[PDB]
Design a protein around this ligand. Sequence first.
Ligand SMILES: *[C@@H]1O[C@H](CO)[C@@H](O[C@@H]2O[C@H](CO)[C@@H](O)[C@H](O)[C@H]2NC(C)=O)[C@H](O)[C@H]1NC(C)=O
Ligand SMILES: *[C@@H]1O[C@H](CO)[C@@H](O[C@@H]2O[C@H](CO)[C@@H](O)[C@H](O)[C@H]2NC(C)=O)[C@H](O)[C@H]1NC(C)=O
Ligand SMILES: *[C@@H]1O[C@H](CO)[C@@H](O[C@@H]2O[C@H](CO)[C@@H](O)[C@H](O)[C@H]2NC(C)=O)[C@H](O)[C@H]1NC(C)=O
Ligand SMILES: *[C@@H]1O[C@H](CO)[C@@H](O[C@@H]2O[C@H](CO)[C@@H](O)[C@H](O)[C@H]2NC(C)=O)[C@H](O)[C@H]1NC(C)=O
Ligand SMILES: *[C@@H]1O[C@H](CO)[C@@H](O[C@@H]2O[C@H](CO)[C@@H](O)[C@H](O)[C@H]2NC(C)=O)[C@H](O)[C@H]1NC(C)=O
Ligand SMILES: *[C@@H]1O[C@H](CO)[C@@H](O[C@@H]2O[C@H](CO)[C@@H](O)[C@H](O)[C@H]2NC(C)=O)[C@H](O)[C@H]1NC(C)=O
Ligand SMILES: *[C@@H]1O[C@H](CO)[C@@H](O)[C@H](O)[C@H]1NC(C)=O
Ligand SMILES: *[C@@H]1O[C@H](CO)[C@@H](O)[C@H](O)[C@H]1NC(C)=O
Ligand SMILES: *[C@@H]1O[C@H](CO)[C@@H](O)[C@H](O)[C@H]1NC(C)=O
Ligand SMILES: *[C@@H]1O[C@H](CO)[C@@H](O)[C@H](O)[C@H]1NC(C)=O
Ligand SMILES: *[C@@H]1O[C@H](CO)[C@@H](O)[C@H](O)[C@H]1NC(C)=O
Ligand SMILES: *[C@@H]1O[C@H](CO)[C@@H](O)[C@H](O)[C@H]1NC(C)=O
Ligand SMILES: *[C@@H]1O[C@H](CO)[C@@H](O)[C@H](O)[C@H]1NC(C)=O
Ligand SMILES: *[C@@H]1O[C@H](CO)[C@@H](O)[C@H](O)[C@H]1NC(C)=O
Ligand SMILES: *[C@@H]1O[C@H](CO)[C@@H](O)[C@H](O)[C@H]1NC(C)=O
Lengths: 11, 11, 11, 171, 171, 171, 322, 322, 322
Amino acid sequence: XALEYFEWLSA
Amino acid sequence: XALEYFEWLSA
Amino acid sequence: XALEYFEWLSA
Amino acid sequence: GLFGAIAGFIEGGWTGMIDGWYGYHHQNEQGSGYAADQKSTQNAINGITNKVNTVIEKMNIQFTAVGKEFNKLEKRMENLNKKVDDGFLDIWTYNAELLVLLENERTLDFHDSNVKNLYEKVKSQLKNNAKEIGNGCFEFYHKCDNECMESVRNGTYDYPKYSEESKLNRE
Amino acid sequence: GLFGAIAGFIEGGWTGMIDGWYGYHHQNEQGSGYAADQKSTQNAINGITNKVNTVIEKMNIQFTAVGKEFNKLEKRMENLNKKVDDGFLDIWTYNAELLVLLENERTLDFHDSNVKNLYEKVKSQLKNNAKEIGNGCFEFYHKCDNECMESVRNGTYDYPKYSEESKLNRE
Amino acid sequence: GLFGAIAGFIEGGWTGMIDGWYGYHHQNEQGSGYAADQKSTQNAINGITNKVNTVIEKMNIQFTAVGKEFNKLEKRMENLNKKVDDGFLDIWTYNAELLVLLENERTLDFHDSNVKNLYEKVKSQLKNNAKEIGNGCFEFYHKCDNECMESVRNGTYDYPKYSEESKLNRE
Amino acid sequence: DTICIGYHANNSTDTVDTVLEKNVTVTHSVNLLEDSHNGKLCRLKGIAPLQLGKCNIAGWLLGNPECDPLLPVRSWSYIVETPNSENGICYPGDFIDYEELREQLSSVSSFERFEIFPKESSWPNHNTNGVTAACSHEGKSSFYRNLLWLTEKEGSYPKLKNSYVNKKGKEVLVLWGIHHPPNSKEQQNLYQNENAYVSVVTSNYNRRFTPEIAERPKVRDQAGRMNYYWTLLKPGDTIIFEANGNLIAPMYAFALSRGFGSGIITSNASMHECNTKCQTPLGAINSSLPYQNIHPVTIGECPKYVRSAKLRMVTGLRNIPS
Amino acid sequence: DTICIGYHANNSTDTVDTVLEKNVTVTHSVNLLEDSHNGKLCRLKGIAPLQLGKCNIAGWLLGNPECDPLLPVRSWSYIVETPNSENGICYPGDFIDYEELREQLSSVSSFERFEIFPKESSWPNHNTNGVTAACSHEGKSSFYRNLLWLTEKEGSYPKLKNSYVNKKGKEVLVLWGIHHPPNSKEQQNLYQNENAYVSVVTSNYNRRFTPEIAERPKVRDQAGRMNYYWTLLKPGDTIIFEANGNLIAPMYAFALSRGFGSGIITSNASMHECNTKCQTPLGAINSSLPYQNIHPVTIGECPKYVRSAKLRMVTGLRNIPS
Amino acid sequence: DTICIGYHANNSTDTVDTVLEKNVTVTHSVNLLEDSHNGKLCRLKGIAPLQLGKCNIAGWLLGNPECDPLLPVRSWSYIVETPNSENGICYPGDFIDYEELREQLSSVSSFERFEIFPKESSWPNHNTNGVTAACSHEGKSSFYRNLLWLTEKEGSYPKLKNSYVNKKGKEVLVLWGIHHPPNSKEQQNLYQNENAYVSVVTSNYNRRFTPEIAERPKVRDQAGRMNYYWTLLKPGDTIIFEANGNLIAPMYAFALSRGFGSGIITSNASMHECNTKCQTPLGAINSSLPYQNIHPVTIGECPKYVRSAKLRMVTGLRNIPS
Ligand SMILES: *[C@@H]1O[C@H](CO)[C@@H](O[C@@H]2O[C@H](CO)[C@@H](O)[C@H](O)[C@H]2NC(C)=O)[C@H](O)[C@H]1NC(C)=O
Ligand SMILES: *[C@@H]1O[C@H](CO)[C@@H](O[C@@H]2O[C@H](CO)[C@@H](O)[C@H](O)[C@H]2NC(C)=O)[C@H](O)[C@H]1NC(C)=O
Ligand SMILES: *[C@@H]1O[C@H](CO)[C@@H](O[C@@H]2O[C@H](CO)[C@@H](O)[C@H](O)[C@H]2NC(C)=O)[C@H](O)[C@H]1NC(C)=O
Ligand SMILES: *[C@@H]1O[C@H](CO)[C@@H](O[C@@H]2O[C@H](CO)[C@@H](O)[C@H](O)[C@H]2NC(C)=O)[C@H](O)[C@H]1NC(C)=O
Ligand SMILES: *[C@@H]1O[C@H](CO)[C@@H](O[C@@H]2O[C@H](CO)[C@@H](O)[C@H](O)[C@H]2NC(C)=O)[C@H](O)[C@H]1NC(C)=O
Ligand SMILES: *[C@@H]1O[C@H](CO)[C@@H](O[C@@H]2O[C@H](CO)[C@@H](O)[C@H](O)[C@H]2NC(C)=O)[C@H](O)[C@H]1NC(C)=O
Ligand SMILES: *[C@@H]1O[C@H](CO)[C@@H](O)[C@H](O)[C@H]1NC(C)=O
Ligand SMILES: *[C@@H]1O[C@H](CO)[C@@H](O)[C@H](O)[C@H]1NC(C)=O
Ligand SMILES: *[C@@H]1O[C@H](CO)[C@@H](O)[C@H](O)[C@H]1NC(C)=O
Ligand SMILES: *[C@@H]1O[C@H](CO)[C@@H](O)[C@H](O)[C@H]1NC(C)=O
Ligand SMILES: *[C@@H]1O[C@H](CO)[C@@H](O)[C@H](O)[C@H]1NC(C)=O
Ligand SMILES: *[C@@H]1O[C@H](CO)[C@@H](O)[C@H](O)[C@H]1NC(C)=O
Ligand SMILES: *[C@@H]1O[C@H](CO)[C@@H](O)[C@H](O)[C@H]1NC(C)=O
Ligand SMILES: *[C@@H]1O[C@H](CO)[C@@H](O)[C@H](O)[C@H]1NC(C)=O
Ligand SMILES: *[C@@H]1O[C@H](CO)[C@@H](O)[C@H](O)[C@H]1NC(C)=O
């Protein structure tokens, strides 16, 4: 899974 | 259980 | 076992 | 924390910073604002992602496992099956809970580590051209616009550039 | 230690201090003595108490478990029961020993952490109004009675109050 | 790292140093060279040796364990035996992998700790008689031959001996 | 001019436990423990379960009349028994190796019901009309749908010998019965031979049955008993029945196909038009989490069952809005 | 003026192991491993165990005469067998499903011994005085206390048929036996029928027994054998015995009550006036520790058994008196 | 003048995984997972295995003629069966408690084959020449090497009664058989008694066998069956055979010695002149590592089997040649 906590993070 | 190593400690 | 990575080490 | 940073000499966090885990708050003549350090944040994200992915991967898919039936003359086999099931259950609950606890502790301490590391990096960048006023904040011995702050953020501060002026204001 | 404090730059402990885990030793004109830092000590006590309580709680009560009997034509079932019992035993011994080892290491390093943290807190409190003479001791650039020492202990040192005199004796 | 040393403010390692894990690189009028710190290195060796020995010892010798056979009317017992074997296998693979992961992390962080500790020890030895030029290197405020470097290496630096000259060159 | 290093904080109220401290509020965390199910019996990988309704396995296999007849051919992903099955063995007696037969059924994915020994056509000179009130249906006395009660015809019970050759290309579950009258009177009245015997043989099966006459405590108003037997007839093999009385002959048998990841569960829930990859007696689980506390009994690809009530792993920092 | 930050030290000689270093001296530590027991058989939660003394389970249930008779009614928390039980099956033969009966007994908390078929009163026209030297007591030839050896009376053994109805409101363990003479001579001399049979039935039990005559190697000076059988008669149900020879009839039976956390252990220790919440074959454990290395066999609420010799957890610091 | 503190680096390309980061290059590391074997069947602690070759356990014990005869006395460390054993039970039938006998054999370390009932000498007035094509050898019809087919002699089958006393000082495995003809015709032609019986007794063994006559599906061109039985005759004890037909008498028996750490494995590999302390069906393991991924089935002192493909533990530092 991905930890999308911030938008600039790469995927 | 309690760790009574010192007397001022709270219980 | 022994980790002989260096020679001065003791055995 | 373990490294004394979080809930330590930096008692609180910044709800104003919502674009990163660690970061900065600059205050100068042009204004004030928050800005996250993307490097260490991305690093932490990657590490913790790999941690969670690991914990999930280490648990194999539990395939079909149903109960069996036994007649009145097979009480021993029934009890044995029960002992097996219950034992495995005990073990797996134990392992799950323990693993989660340990990993949580290690994670918290990891964040502490990262914050303190960032602070130390900045400090070693600035040296005696600024002073530590506590709460993880530095006060400059000189003027610093947005470009200077940016030079500090992305790890490219110039010490000889301000060494003289700082030396003056230091007295 | 891991943080280099205990058995590090503070080679030994104080048997004279018997009312705390971490603490202080003050030496001035009015005399000398030991006095524990109750905050970090209470914190450590709470943490470790919760740790031990956890390890105890994670072990469910082992209820009644007796051996069974088998005749001469049930050797396979007998051997299977034995394999189950022995396997579970292996696993639980393994888990117990491992857990205790890991937790002990983490505990030692935790104490190291707390000591170093206390030292850093005091150091950041004093700044350049004193000098680090090694062995985790500070030498004052000024006079300090019992009230001053007490002001340092409970985290309320006054830097501007002694900054001038210290600046003088520093030369 | 966790302590910010390895792959941190000391970005790379020295392939030139092949007689130790941690060490020094001296540069003076008589020449330059590498030399390992035998104390902390021997310590690390001992600790990690005991760690590996532990992990090996915690695994008891797996004695003879063969499969059994079952007829067409003993499918339940067969399936139970299979469930036991498979369960134990799952558990042991889980434990092995997890243990190795945790121990590897702890080991890396341990080395980080040792390096930073060495650096701090040297720094506290030198004090203001030298300056931190980054990359874990110190620049002297005075001349230092091989004997002086040796005095620093084995933990016997003399501060009052060079305090005056250093104070001069510091200006 | 000043600059500060600090860390994230937000309105998260997520709590996690550690070794040192319980109940720590944090900024980001993931839940590893699935605790939600849909309370429905669902299709597993596109395949519907086999619901037995009023019947249990025995009542189904023997062909208890009180249960609504199924299709001749069925495929399933798992078998569902209701907790309250009043319909099973309706004529008192022992189903020999019943549990083992259940275990066999746990790896069966399909059955074809077929007439192995046709009613009027396989047992000449024998009566095939026997019924009983223990196996009632719609008030009238009846009998198992898949079995046939052979009785004396015209005051005689000739030695019967019939055989079936398995040309189905699959294992064939064959069931039969042995009747045990309470007295030698009924024994003579039904089979005309006080010293009767039943013989069933295959290539690997070989059993002989002898009537055991004695008065017994009434069960379902019957002093007589009936023992039920089964065997898996391998492809190409032949089963031979040879008896001179007391045989409850096979009429229908089952062609079985084998599968994987099947099982038998006891559940209250009802079948709905839904599909899942994990089924529990309480309902279906739709999750990618490694752990679950819903039920120990699972069919399909499921998370490992644990007793825990909470397994929350922290990803963010200690949240301090101060 | 100076101030110093330091840590605790004391005379503690406690040693603990870590992953990196073995045998570290520390200021404070807790022991998690219980290794102490009192060497006594004790009451478990106020309830005394059932000690069989010279007898084992079989010798007790069959009623071996060499063992001191117990009270008609007993309650226990666990059953204790002595390692050296010379008194058990005193007449050679097989106790069928013996282990299963033990497993049943492992969840039994109480028994009432009662006379199910009174001596002179249930078997008219049969001799009930048969004894043997294999079951000796005080020198004289005797027999099991709970069984009755029915022999021929006046040169005839009439077909007996007796029954008992379970109105005890509890499960009733009923035991009986089948005698097997070494020759047809003794067969005729004892039961007068060379083709005898025993029949035992209940609602769910149904078994027929046939004498097997052959010369056998002497065991306890007996060429004859005796097979022992048992069944649990459900409340309200009826057991029927119907035999024309070779039956070792039931005289006493047991009303059983079910319980939890019981079991059977083999122990040397003696009963003392003490109470515990955890019992091992070696003695009682009084502890709140999570682990124990005393014994794998436990009754009650006990710590988990491990093979370890030391499980000490450090709470204090590394102790350095330097 | 300058001085620097730094750490080791080298050309190591060793990679290890951590919780935070996968595939970390390091300077020093140890492998804990053994993955190498020699593909050979070896001696275990100096003792060679018992290879059965073309035979399986049953074919060996019964004495199947198609298998090369072993030495009268053998000792082993483990037994090896080939996957493709076409030689086993050559006369169709059931080997009763076969698996249990295998389990017994798993703790047997030695056997002595000996003639318990000599051919012409133990069965007077009976023919001992019976053979069959189901047990062929070199084209000619034959029979089991360790059993003897007793048939009628001169139109009569006298009741035989022979016995053996175990004076070997060890357990003696005794095997025998019961023949079941397809019809009463062959029954009379072979044993002259339509109501025959076999009786086998010891001090603790007691079994009676009755012929079961019925036409059966041909297996290995035989409508008849043959059931094989075994028992462990304790030291000093006596076994008695008493039959009037249908007995496949014992001719050879086995004196068994018990051992530890033995077992039965199925393997393709061949015996070589080598020695090991750990044996798998794939080959021998020579290792001091705690883990192995070679095979779950092990004999001797072996590492714990795991499913892992890699268990590498880091000892050195993160290697950075920069
Ligand atoms: C890091 O910060 C330095 C200083 O701000 C940046 O240098 C500026 O980069 C821009 C490009 O957008 C140039 O046009 C400016 O003139 C630069 N300032 C200076 C000091 O000349 C640098 O671009 C930043 N980026 C990185 C990755 O270092
Ligand atoms: C912490 O130390 C400061 C300094 O000693 C204490 O301030 C003193 O408190 C007492 C009360 O007993 C006052 O009467 C003294 O006059 C105070 N000294 C000063 C500097 O005025 C303070 O009370 C201590 N306690 C805490 C928790 O801060
Ligand atoms: C540590 O370093 C100090 C300084 O180099 C060493 O002192 C020298 O030791 C040698 C012996 O080989 C003497 O002959 C030299 O004269 C010493 N130098 C000085 C300053 O006098 C010391 O020997 C080293 N060893 C240890 C363990 O401290
Ligand atoms: C677990 O932590 C939660 C969250 O802090 C605690 O709940 C707080 O409960 C108190 C008492 O009701 C309220 O005043 C707070 O407002 C709650 N906080 C939130 C954010 O909801 C709870 O008390 C803790 N439980 C335990 C047993 O530690
Ligand atoms: C474990 O630690 C103990 C405690 O230090 C060691 O025992 C010491 O033993 C030496 C040798 O007999 C004595 O001189 C010390 O006085 C003992 N110390 C105490 C406080 O009793 C012991 O040697 C260590 N064991 C191992 C194998 O490491
Ligand atoms: C695991 O680490 C190895 C070692 O760094 C990686 O292999 C490198 O692979 C790249 C791509 O082929 C090569 O350019 C490097 O030269 C390799 N390094 C060495 C030293 O062999 C590998 O890519 C990594 N694998 C994963 C999936 O992380
Ligand atoms: C947290 O705040 C966000 C707004 O940024 C809101 O959408 C969300 O519902 C809040 N969640 C909680 C648990 O307070
Ligand atoms: C389903 O069965 C359970 C017993 O297992 C019972 O508690 C519950 O009431 C039943 N619910 C429904 C809806 O039938
Ligand atoms: C299962 O959960 C996933 C995650 O939301 C969702 O995409 C999917 O629709 C769910 N499937 C069903 C059938 O509910
Ligand atoms: C430690 O010293 C105390 C006195 O403070 C004494 O009571 C105790 O017996 C000592 N224990 C050990 C183990 O030395
Ligand atoms: C108790 O029995 C054990 C054998 O289990 C024996 O070693 C010991 O001598 C016996 N002790 C006593 C006191 O009877
Ligand atoms: C069990 O141990 C506790 C702890 O000392 C004690 O209070 C209690 O008296 C002990 N009980 C008995 C019966 O010995
Ligand atoms: C590492 O370098 C050494 C030379 O010091 C060489 O002997 C060895 O083969 C090399 N190993 C690898 C894996 O590169
Ligand atoms: C050994 O047996 C295996 C099957 O278990 C088979 O795959 C392989 O081909 C065989 N190899 C040899 C050399 O006989
Ligand atoms: C087993 O491995 C060890 C380690 O090299 C070696 O000394 C020994 O010769 C090996 N033994 C055999 C028989 O191969």
